[PDB]
Design a protein around this nucleic acid. Sequence first.
DNA 1: GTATTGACTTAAAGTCTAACCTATAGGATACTTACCAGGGACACGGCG
Length: 44
Amino acid sequence: EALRQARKDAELTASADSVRAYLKQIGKVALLNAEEEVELAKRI
DNA sequence: GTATTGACTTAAAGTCTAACCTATAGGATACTTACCAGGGACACGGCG
């Protein structure tokens, strides 16, 4: 509950440091596995 | 001294050929979030 509000408040922060901001934005998307890779490549 | 021609050799190109740089591509086990001051003035967010 309070932890949830804390996490949300955190997500709305700049962190100034541009490396820090990019390192934050790259973690949004999860990784994949082999079958996901092959289906994705087939789509491409 | 100042008017010439006929050779006689020479550096500077002008060019063809060869090697030595240069722009570029590629590489398939798997690896997935880096790292001691003060002193004054002005502006922004909270609280009453």
